[PDB]
A paper describes a structure:
Human factor D (FD) is a self-inhibited thrombin-like serine proteinase that is critical for amplification of the complement immune response. FD is a single-domain serine protease that has a unique physiological substrate. It converts the surface-bound alternative pathway pro-convertase C3bB into the active convertase C3bBb. A salt bridge between Arg202 (Arg218) on the self-inhibitory loop and Asp177 (Asp189) locks the S1 pocket and rigidifies the exosite.
Here, ensemble refinement (ER) of FD and thrombin crystal structures is used to evaluate structure and dynamics simultaneously. Using ER, we detected a highly flexible state of an FD variant [R202A (R218A)]. ER modelled a large number of alternative conformations for the exosite loops, with root-mean-square (r.m.s.) differences in amino-acid positions of up to 6 Å. Different crystal-packing environments of the two copies in the asymmetric unit showed different amounts of disorder of the exosite loops, as indicated by large displacements of the exosite loops 1, 3 and 4 in the first copy and of loop 4 in the other copy. We initially observed an unfolding of the N-terminus that did not account for the observed electron density; therefore, for subsequent runs of this data set a weak harmonic restraint was placed on the Cα atom of the terminal Ile. To assert the consistency of the ensemble model, ten parallel simulations were performed differing only in the random number seed used to generate the initial velocities. The ensemble repeats show high real-space correlation values between ensemble repeats, the majority of which are greater than 0.95, with a minimum of 0.60 around the exosite loops showing high flexibility, demonstrating the reproducibility of the ER method. Release of this conformational interlock results in increased catalytic activity towards artificial peptides and displays a distribution of inactive and active conformations of the catalytic site (60%:40% active:inactive conformations of the catalytic triad, in contrast to the 100% inactive conformation observed in wild-type FD). ER of the FD R202A mutant highlights increased exosite dynamics upon release of the Arg202–Asp177 (Arg218–Asp189) self-inhibitory lock, revealing a highly flexible state reminiscent of an ensemble of conformational states traditionally described as the Na+-free ‘slow’ form of thrombin. The dual role of Arg202 (Arg218) in FD self-inhibition and substrate recognition suggests that the conformational dynamics of the FD R202A (R218A) mutant ensemble may represent a highly flexible intermediate state between the disruption of the Arg202–Asp177 (Arg218–Asp189) self-inhibitory lock and interaction with binding partners.
Numbering used by the authors: 1 to 228
Write the structure that this text describes.
């Protein structure tokens, strides 16, 4: 963190921790009983494995009755994802079994209609912090409300300089100091999944630095198809 606050425990029952070898790698979002959406860059690299997903968690380290760790039957990165690009940066993970659903675990509706989130809309992003930003990292789930930034301005020569295609969206990042982006994590507007974090901003510095998110509606055809 240097954006935000501790979330209410289990009030985002869609939130997932994508894990490598039992350590938090990336955020993700439960989009169907057996399927979690995250970002391709997360699981990018090569060797392995023991990629799993933790559902029903608030703390990454402490006992909680709802916590369940799922192995993954299949990792499906968007075919057009590339290591050297923030395009098509989505990742679907098929869980070993249907998630057991309840107050702490519950898929989130996601936007199928390909329309942009209106600029100014307040959306919610949640996650758990990187490298080991404090060994247990941030240990409990954090979130913050960010206003959506118009694509035009996001594309300014000082913001993101034409990088933001119509398949991407932006949020004002955060003034005062810097940064965040769990990655793979979700951007939720009015209770609907609209975006997934991409390395926006992993080049942090300005005042009006914006976060970059992949628009899930733009990939609705690919998502649904992997699900069927």
């Amino acid at each position: 963190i240097l954006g935000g606050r501790e979330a209410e425990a289990h009030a985002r029952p869609y939130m997932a921790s994508v894990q490598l070898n039992g350590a938090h790698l990336c955020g993700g979002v439960l989009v169907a009983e057996q399927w979690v959406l995250s970002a391709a860059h997360c699981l990018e690299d090569a060797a392995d494995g023991k990629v799993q997903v933790l559902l029903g968690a608030h703390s990454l380290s402490q006992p909680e009755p709802s916590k369940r760790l799922y192995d993954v039957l299949r990792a499906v990165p968007h075919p057009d994802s590339q290591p050297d690009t923030i395009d098509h940066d989505l990742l679907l993970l098929q869980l070993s079994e249907k998630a057991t659903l309840g107050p702490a675990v519950r898929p989130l509706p996601w936007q199928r209609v390909d329309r942009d989130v209106a600029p100014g809309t307040l959306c919610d992003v949640a996650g758990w912090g990187i490298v080991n930003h404090a060994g247990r990292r941030p240990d409990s789930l954090q979130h913050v409300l960010l206003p959506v930034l118009d694509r035009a301005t996001c594309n300014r020569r000082t913001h993101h300089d034409g990088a933001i295609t119509e398949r991407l969206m932006c949020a004002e990042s955060n003034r005062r100091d810097s940064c965040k982006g769990d990655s793979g994590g979700p951007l939720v507007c009015g209770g609907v999944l609209e975006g997934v974090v991409t390395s926006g901003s992993a080049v942090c510095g300005n005042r009006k630095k914006p976060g970059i998110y992949t628009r899930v509606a733009s990939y609705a055809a690919w998502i649904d198809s992997v699900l069927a």
